[PDB]
Amino acid sequence: NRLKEKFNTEVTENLMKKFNYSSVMEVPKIDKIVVNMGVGDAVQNSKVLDNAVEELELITGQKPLVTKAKKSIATFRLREGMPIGAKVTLRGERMYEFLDKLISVSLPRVRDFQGVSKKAFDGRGNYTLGVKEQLIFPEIDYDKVSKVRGMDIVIVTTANTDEEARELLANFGMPFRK
Amino acid sequence: MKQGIHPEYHQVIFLDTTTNFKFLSGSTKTSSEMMEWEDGKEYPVIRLDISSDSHPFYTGRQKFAAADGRVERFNKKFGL
Amino acid sequence: RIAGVDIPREKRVVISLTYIYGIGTSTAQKILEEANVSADTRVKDLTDDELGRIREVVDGYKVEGDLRRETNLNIKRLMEISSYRGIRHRRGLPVRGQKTKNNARTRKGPVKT
Amino acid sequence: ARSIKKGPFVDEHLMKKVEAQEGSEKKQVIKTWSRRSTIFPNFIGHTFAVYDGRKHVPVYVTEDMVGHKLGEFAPTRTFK
RNA sequence: UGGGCUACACACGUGCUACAAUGGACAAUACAAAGGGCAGCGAAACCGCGAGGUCAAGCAAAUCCCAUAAAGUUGUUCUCAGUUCGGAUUGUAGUCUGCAACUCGACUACAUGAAGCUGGAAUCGCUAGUAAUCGUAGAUCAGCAUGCUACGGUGAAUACGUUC
Numbered sequence: 257n258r259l260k261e262k263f264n265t266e267v268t269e270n271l272m273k274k275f276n277y278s279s280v281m282e283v284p285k286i287d288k289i290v291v292n293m294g295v296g297d298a299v300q301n302s303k304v305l306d307n308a309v310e311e312l313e314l315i316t317g318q319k320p321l322v323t324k325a326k327k328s329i330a331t332f333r334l335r336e337g338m339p340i341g342a343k344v345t346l347r348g349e350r351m352y353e354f355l356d357k358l359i360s361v362s363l364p365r366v367r368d369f370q371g372v373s374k375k376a377f378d379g380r381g382n383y384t385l386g387v388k389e390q391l392i393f394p395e396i397d398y399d400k401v402s403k404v405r406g407m408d409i410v411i412v413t414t415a416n417t418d419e420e421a422r423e424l425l426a427n428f429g430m431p432f433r434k
Numbered sequence: 435m436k437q438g439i440h441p442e443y444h445q446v447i448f449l450d451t452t453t454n455f456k457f458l459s460g461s462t463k464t465s466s467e468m469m470e471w472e473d474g475k476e477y478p479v480i481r482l483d484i485s486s487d488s489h490p491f492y493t494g495r496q497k498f499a500a501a502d503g504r505v506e507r508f509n510k511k512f513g514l
Numbered sequence: 515r516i517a518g519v520d521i522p523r524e525k526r527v528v529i530s531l532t533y534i535y536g537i538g539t540s541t542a543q544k545i546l547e548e549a550n551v552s553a554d555t556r557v558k559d560l561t562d563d564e565l566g567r568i569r570e571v572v573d574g575y576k577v578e579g580d581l582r583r584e585t586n587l588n589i590k591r592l593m594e595i596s597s598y599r600g601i602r603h604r605r606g607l608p609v610r611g612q613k614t615k616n617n618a619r620t621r622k623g624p625v626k627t
Numbered sequence: 628a629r630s631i632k633k634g635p636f637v638d639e640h641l642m643k644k645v646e647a648q649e650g651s652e653k654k655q656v657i658k659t660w661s662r663r664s665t666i667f668p669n670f671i672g673h674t675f676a677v678y679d680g681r682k683h684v685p686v687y688v689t690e691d692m693v694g695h696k697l698g699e700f701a702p703t704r705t706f707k
Numbered sequence: 708u709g710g711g712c713u714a715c716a717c718a719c720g721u722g723c724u725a726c727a728a729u730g731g732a733c734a735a736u737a738c739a740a741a742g743g744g745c746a747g748c749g750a751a752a753c754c755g756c757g758a759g760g761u762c763a764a765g766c767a768a769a770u771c772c773c774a775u776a777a778a779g780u781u782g783u784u785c786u787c788a789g790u791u792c793g794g795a796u797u798g799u800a801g802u803c804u805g806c807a808a809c810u811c812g813a814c815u816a817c818a819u820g821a822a823g824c825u826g827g828a829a830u831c832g833c834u835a836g837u838a839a840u841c842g843u844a845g846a847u848c849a850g851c852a853u854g855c856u857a858c859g860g861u862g863a864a865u866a867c868g869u870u871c
């Protein structure tokens with residue numbers, strides 16, 4: 257619980273001092289992490305989705321939930337109810353472990369890493385990170401992976417504003433592009 | 435968590451070989467090599483070429499100096 | 515993995531190092547000599563201590579993203595200053611004074627009869 | 628001159644014209660037929676009217692332009 | 708004086724280099740001919756990764772120098788792929804000539820690493836020291852050759868025959 261321990265002690269102290277929170281409950285926290293992989297290629301080949309599912313299962317350590325198309329789009333050759341993606345929701349200990357690994361190992365492994373974007377906030381204190389390849393994650397092996405694929409990592413924070421969210425992520429040690 | 439639907443996940447020690455930084459976090463990676471920890475337990479060790487401690491961006495270390503200006507290079511090159 | 519690149523395991527390390535941007539045959543031979551790692555040993559048969567030794571040396575050389583970024587800026591500089599060379603970079607025509615009545619296909623792309 | 632031992636080549640008339648212009652802030656255009664002359668650090672801020680073979684074309688030196696010939700920044704051929 | 712003759716959506720002729728294992732790289736080790744040279748050829752030595760630089764012997768020639776041929780031979784390694792094939796292109800840092808290499812030179816180093824997997828219709832040369840292949844020299848010439856003109860090394864296949 258290294259990341260959790262920091263949050264409980266060091267991060268909480270920094271945030272409450274910074275924003276003059278009246279109560280400890282006010283202090284922002286990361287509610288959940290959702291990893292989404294969109295696989296439109298799955299329409300062309302079912303195997304592509306299967307390979308993605310395995311990769312996400314390895315990365316997160318939990319079985320992904322296959323996502324089915326809400327609607328049919330002719331341009332994408334998409335039919336409603338077709339499996340075109342996979343998602344995992346990480347909560348509790350699993351979330352902290354994944355996040356610490358991302359900052360500690362996976363983000364460093366990113367090729368030509370120049371820090372993460374500071375502008376990637378929804379305006380409601382929620383941050384989304386896009387990874388170019390899943391090779392960055394330590395578990396994934398280059399030989400095993402037939403096709404390099406990107407992923408969306410959404411970090412949902414209880415923080416009302418981006419600035420409070422930015423502080424929380426900075427305290428966690430998330431690199432920022434500045 | 436549902437039983438039998440999730441991949442085996444175990445605490446593993448991630449070691450930065452370059453800076454000898456050790457941290458314990460969960461992973462589905464299995465390592466034949468195992469290392470002792472501060473707590474009285476032994477975990478499989480995953481070796482990392484680079485990490486937050488070693489990575490240049492995180493450190494802020496400048497591996498290479500900035501490119502010289504056109505005026506600077508001209509003067510330096512011909513000694514003028 | 516060296517300099518952010520997963521080099522081919524099967525090949526000898528002299529050759530495998532050249533699969534990194536900024537490293538060619540000449541540089542690869544130098545880096546192995548400095549690290550005192552044999553050229554013949556295959557990457558699959560490389561040792562962890564040896565790998566670290568190689569990694570120290572490769573850190574010495576500007577490679578991959580670092581070199582790519584530098585090269586692009588020099589070309590961008592030429593284009594911005596409106597140099598003859600820079601203008602030809604913009605036009606996609608031979609920059610180093612080669613004739614264009616014939617040939618120039620690598621720069622011009624495929625034929626457009 | 629490409630060889631380092633020889634200095635960068637500049638026509639004396641061009642260099643002398645620039646050197647006289649050093650004193651006054653309000654620089655005036657320098658007409659030149661010297662496409663061959665190197666752009667020195669001293670040239671920065673000056674506008675040279677370099678001949679293209681038919682007309683003198685205004686060329687204004689910037690920092691990046693140092694080390695390149697004056698001819699490089701005035702075209703001799705026209706296409707489309 | 709400067710620019711152009713060096714343009715570039717394209718079409719054609721003649722060449723150069725490849726598409727690898729009858730090869731690539733590396734190392735060791737042989738065998739030519741025909742030419743050129745006075746302010747020109749320049750050795751050896753030292754320095755540079757190298758292109759070169761420095762100093763300078765000999766030599767107006769069966770004497771000295773250009774100038775160690777290369778393919779070859781014997782090993783080592785790679786192992787059938789866009790690669791340890793190929794080397795276009797581009798970046799950068801140099802060398803040399805010259806008054807000056809921007810337009811627009813040649814060469815080097817490092818990096819970069821295109822097309823190309825043997826070529827549709829069609830079409831060319833060659834009957835033996837020939838073709839093929841490998842290097843060598845000269846004229847022009849400050850520098851600048853995949854061209855031209857010469858040179859030797861290795862060295863084939865096939866020709867029934869004259870209907871077309």
Ligand SMILES: [Mg+2]
Nearest residue numbers: 613615712713
């Ligand atoms: Mg002509």
